Ligand binder design. Structure first.
Ligand SMILES: *[C@@H]1O[C@H](CO)[C@@H](O[C@@H]2O[C@H](CO)[C@@H](O)[C@H](O)[C@H]2NC(C)=O)[C@H](O)[C@H]1NC(C)=O
Ligand SMILES: *[C@@H]1O[C@H](CO)[C@@H](O[C@@H]2O[C@H](CO)[C@@H](O)[C@H](O)[C@H]2NC(C)=O)[C@H](O)[C@H]1NC(C)=O
Ligand SMILES: *[C@H]1O[C@H](CO)[C@@H](O)[C@H](O)[C@H]1NC(C)=O
Ligand SMILES: *[C@H]1O[C@H](CO)[C@@H](O)[C@H](O)[C@H]1NC(C)=O
Lengths: 532, 532
């Protein structure tokens, strides 16, 4: 039967699903690790023991335990991001969409969700792989991984809560796809990993990590890179936060053994309820439990790995959205609200700058404020709001990514860079937020092809182009069709540094993406904060 | 007789001179101090002892001893600035142009020449006062003062070479005008002092100095202010340079008495020949012997006098030229030449930055380089040349002056600000130098009214407007005619900060003159260099 597949872990039975007046197969909720519960909470994941009988893979699995956004109850803009299934620590599952009839050996794409390493679900409506699987004839896989303290509590040295176990969950699933995707018609020698925000930084981390590089062929990173300032912490800071977590739950703190045992006795929600209290600063765009630079998963510092070429050499395709900072300002900077235009006063601007660059001394804050202030019109509320947006996006996403691409391109085998700047016509968030991070995802997964979702015709066309760029890059390592007549997305090179805009207008090619601001964030400010 | 005037120092006899098909009186070379020669070299000036008989005031006096620019032998662009009379330490004289018939009590304007405190002459063709005296019916006075070591060698504590004696020479002449200008038809209760570059910083210094403020009514400052970085040094640096001067002449250095005696035995040119060897850094726009912050002429630091309102409160009119830095780059930065367009390479840019901001550590040089570099087009030779021009002009003239006007306006009685950006059609310097500092002077003294000089008609008109703005401001404290129909030069205010452009086009009013760059030079960089 077409819905029955025999894998090395056992038999699995999918389900037929409709998609754009046709059908394909879906194998939802396939287990790839033993449930990380009880004594295994915080531990490295173990492989799933093979099973007898047929695994029913017809419904979505539980989503991992996470903080849930209740900031706007009933607003779809925020709720489309929340877990849409029961939460549970038994959550390590993957989903596969397979063209019908079953391919024999086609290109595979594995999606890694974002969510700041503290949240995220593989089952969100915007992550539904049937449109891309069907339109580009690829086998689409979405995986899951532990988030929050469950995925990233780190007490370096202890083997019970070593840290990075959330990254090892992603890795185990990549191992399972390597070992079994052939039975679903996928070609294991052609898998592309891709993801957004923390999913994009994760992708960059498997490119760096020696233990992960052999499990995939190519990579796509959307608004995230491994060197982002919010994506990793030192073993010492990881340790400090784990102890503070324990102190918030009245744990015995005399040894790692004692702390870990107390944390393992707590219900999931007791951990989620105090998670945010461990941040070292009053900050924006900073998350509590994130990957740790441990000497194992990452052999040395990220920057020294980048400089020395210590990473997988292959082709990459990556980019960012125009307004990366707005979500974070809305939720945590003063003067911003969902239902107003959020014109910012000079006081609120300064407050925002301090929140955006937590680790900066006063000279540093003055350097940032001067770089983004138009002194001929310093009380322009819209300019202050947009300047803050840019400060957050450049410091947290764009410049870190630009630094990664320039370092990578030096040893890589081909880089394609984009700047996504089309705001969706049906976005429910206010206009002032612009092209919000994550809102390029619906176009990558092809939602504009379904009429009832209400996109425009040009939006459906943009979706088809991005899907085909992503799937052609995955199959061949180049997003362009060989002899097509369409205009070409040029390769990004150390010298010319070209990139393309991605929107409903005719492709325009540019050079040196936000160079002015990125020389400030990647060269000057680090130098200013180190000397001073 | 109209050419004979009896002053308190004695009788003086002028000469009738033609001017634009008419005539006026000129009293050239009137002595206002005893010759500062021999033992009086470096000493404060003494009043000129009254004389019997008639002082022949029909020819220009000697110019003070100074370094002479031989960088372009025979080129008029540089030679029109060189001494045009025999040099001599007997040089303290003043010149007066008086309307005919002799006024009874008219507005007086006293010109103080620039020249970096190391050079300058009151007798230059561009400083000829007959055109302004005649056209605006004012009594025009030009004074002289010791420059170089002769005017500014400073060994604070010793009464033989105290420093600032060049400033006291200007002051003595202002005293003589206060006491005698009435006999020439001038009104001593209405004298305006005005000057350019070091002459403009001098004017600002008499506004600050308690011993000078009662000798004049109003002030005009052209491309210079007292707080400029090249206009003063501490008593300790003054001292260091005086000792180094002595060491370059093999002087006995055991006491001030010994050093001073050796320096007094040297011929003038032995001093001028080694003058430049005492600079502490490889620099541009820095001069050896300049005013010293001594606790007498300046009671406390300039910035604390400015902050506390410790200065003469009156009306001021001041401004700058568009391309203040070009002269200094031409003469001392690498890659610039008189007969080429001077496109600058990135190496030469960086060399120039280091020369322009001598006192800066590496982080500081990086801060300047980032602020003036267009990172999307960093090898643009013209952009590098123009950026260097701006760096020199903003740091040395424009921003210091902008800081002075904002501090002054808070306690003053009226400020008028201009931005002169018309390049003269007959300029012999190359195009790349732009509106060169000092080339607004010919328009202030009215040279475009004499046909044989070859200016355009619109240039003659601009000259007439500037002459009338300067002379009306001098007479009334406002450059505008009461009920004229001409557009108005608005007052500069703490809040609106308005200024006007000054050129051959219809007057345009603007606000916050080079604010972006000046917040960098007046607020951020000083803060960066103090912390680091
Ligand atoms: C990616 O790698 C391939 C092969 O490793 C590069 O192609 C080789 O290019 C060199 C120099 O141009 C030739 O000597 C070889 O004959 C090529 N080999 C093959 C199989 O084509 C290719 O240039 C690389 N691409 C990038 C963008 O670096
Ligand atoms: C310059 O000073 C004069 C007088 O010191 C100012 O005029 C006075 O203004 C105050 C308040 O407007 C009035 O009470 C007086 O009657 C005015 N006196 C005279 C003689 O007019 C004038 O405003 C000042 N100008 C500036 C630009 O500060
Ligand atoms: C497993 O899938 C769902 C479970 O909710 C349901 O159709 C049925 O219980 C199972 N299907 C089969 C074929 O066992
Ligand atoms: C003084 O002026 C010049 C000196 O060069 C000359 O005309 C003459 O010697 C003198 N004139 C008078 C009237 O004494």
């Amino acid at each position: 039967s077409e819905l029955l597949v025999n894998t090395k872990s056992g038999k699995v039975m999918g389900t037929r699903v409709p998609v754009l007046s046709s059908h394909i197969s879906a194998f939802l909720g396939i287990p790839f690790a033993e449930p990380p519960v009880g004594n295994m909470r915080f531990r490295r994941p173990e492989p799933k023991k093979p099973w007898s009988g047929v695994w029913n893979a017809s419904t979505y699995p539980n989503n991992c335990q996470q903080y849930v956004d209740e900031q706007f109850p009933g607003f779809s803009g925020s709720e489309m991001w929340n877990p849409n299934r029961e939460m549970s620590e038994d959550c390590l599952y993957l989903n596969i969409w397979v063209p019908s009839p079953r391919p024999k050996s086609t290109t595979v794409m594995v999606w890694i969700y974002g969510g700041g390493f503290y949240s995220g679900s593989s089952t969100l409506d915007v992550y539904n792989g049937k449109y891309l699987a069907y339109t580009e004839e690829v086998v689409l896989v979405s995986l899951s991984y532990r988030v929050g303290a469950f995925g990233f509590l780190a007490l370096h040295g202890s083997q019970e809560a070593p840290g990075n176990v959330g990254l090892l969950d992603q890795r185990m699933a990549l191992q399972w796809v390597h070992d079994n995707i052939q039975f679903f018609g996928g070609d294991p020698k052609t898998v592309t990993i891709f993801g957004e925000s923390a999913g994009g930084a994760s992708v960059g981390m498997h490119i760096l990590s020696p233990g992960s590089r052999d499990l995939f062929r190519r990579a796509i990173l959307q608004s995230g890179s491994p060197n982002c300032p919010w994506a990793s912490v030192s073993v010492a800071e990881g340790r400090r936060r784990a102890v503070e977590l324990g102190r918030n739950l009245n744990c015995n703190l005399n040894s790692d053994e004692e702390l870990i045992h107390c944390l393992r006795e707590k219900k999931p929600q007791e951990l989620i309820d105090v998670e945010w209290n461990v941040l070292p600063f009053d900050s924006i765009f900073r998350f509590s439990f994130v990957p740790v630079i441990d000497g194992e998963f990452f052999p040395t510092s990220l920057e020294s790995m980048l400089n020395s070429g210590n990473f997988k050499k292959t082709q990459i395709l990556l980019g960012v959205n125009k307004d990366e900072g707005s979500f974070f300002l809305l939720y945590g900077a003063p003067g911003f609200s969902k239902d107003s235009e959020s014109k910012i006063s000079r006081e609120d601007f300064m407050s925002g700058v301090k929140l955006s660059v937590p680790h900066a001394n006063d000279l540093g804050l003055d350097a940032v404020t001067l770089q983004y202030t138009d002194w001929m019109d310093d009380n322009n509320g819209i300019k202050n709001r947009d300047g803050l947006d840019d400060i957050v996006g450049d410091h947290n996403v764009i410049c870190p990514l630009m630094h990664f691409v320039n370092k990578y391109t030096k040893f890589g085998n081909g880089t394609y860079l984009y700047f996504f700047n089309h705001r969706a016509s049906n976005l429910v968030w206010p206009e002032w937020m612009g092209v919000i991070h994550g809102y390029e995802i619906e176009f990558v997964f092809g939602l504009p092809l379904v009429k009832e979702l209400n996109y425009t015709a040009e939006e459906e066309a943009l979706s088809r182009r991005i899907m085909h760029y992503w799937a052609t890059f995955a199959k061949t390592g180049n997003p362009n069709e060989p002899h097509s007549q369409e205009s070409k997305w040029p390769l990004f090179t150390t010298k010319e540094q070209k990139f393309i805009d991605l929107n409903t207008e005719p492709m325009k090619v540019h050079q040196r993406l936000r160079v002015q601001m990125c020389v400030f964030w990647n060269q000057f400010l680090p130098k200013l904060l180190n000397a001073t």
